[PDB]
Amino acid sequence: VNSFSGYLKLTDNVYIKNADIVEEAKKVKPTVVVNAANVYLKHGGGVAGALNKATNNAMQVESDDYIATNGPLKVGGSCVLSGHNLAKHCLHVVGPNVNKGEDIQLLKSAYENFNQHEVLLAPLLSAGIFGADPIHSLRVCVDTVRTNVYLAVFDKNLYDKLVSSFL
Numbered sequence: 001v002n003s004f005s006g007y008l009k010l011t012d013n014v015y016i017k018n019a020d021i022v023e024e025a026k027k028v029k030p031t032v033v034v035n036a037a038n039v040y041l042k043h044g045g046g047v048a049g050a051l052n053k054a055t056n057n058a059m060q061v062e063s064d065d066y067i068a069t070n071g072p073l074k075v076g077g078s079c080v081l082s083g084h085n086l087a088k089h090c091l092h093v094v095g096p097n098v099n100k101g102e103d104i105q106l107l108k109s110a111y112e113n114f115n116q117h118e119v120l121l122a123p124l125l126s127a128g129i130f131g132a133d134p135i136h137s138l139r140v141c142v143d144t145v146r147t148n149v150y151l152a153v154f155d156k157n158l159y160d161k162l163v164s165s166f167l
């Protein structure tokens with residue numbers, strides 16, 4: 001039993017809810033919140049911009065130190081950093097950006113990072129300003145993630161479409 005509330009169960013291990021991931025994290029304080037990161041950990045907009053803003057830019061400060069030491073992530077890759085005031089940890093996961101021409105097959109690799117954590121709060125990877133089809137992102141999620149994932153979808157209209165079209 002965990003503290004996530006109001007989720008629709010899609011499969012044995014995948015759950016979905018119309019919610020602002022920022023507000024959801026502040027309420028649950030999950031062990032892991034997933035960020036929709038880019039390889040430079042520049043948290044400018046979308047999920048990343050919103051999460052970083054909620055940490056009062058502490059996420060960005062920590063991320064800049066990480067990049068200065070380690071260099072950029074790979075598309076499809078991830079790193080674990082602090083969750084600041086939102087979660088114990090933040091798993092920064094880089095899904096492919098379609099508005100940069102990146103291979104959508106990398107979306108499966110991105111979701112594989114979730115399997116290293118027993119429970120996660122997460123957005124749909126590559127959705128929103130990353131330009132991929134969110135229906136597809138949900139399908140890859142369900143078919144790749146085996147650990148317990150609680151998906152927050154900011155847009156109510158998108159949430160209803162995801163639920164109504166889910167096979």
Ligand SMILES: Cc1c[nH]c2ncnc(C(=O)N[C@H](CC(=O)O)c3ccc(Br)cc3)c12
Pocket residue numbers: 019020021022036045046047050051095123124125126127128129130152153154155158
């Ligand atoms: C901005 C924001 C604040 N709080 C949030 N909680 C949840 N999600 C989002 C958000 O930007 N989501 C979109 C898709 C959707 O509309 O769910 C999305 C955009 C880029 C990528 Br890469 C992946 C997903 C937010």
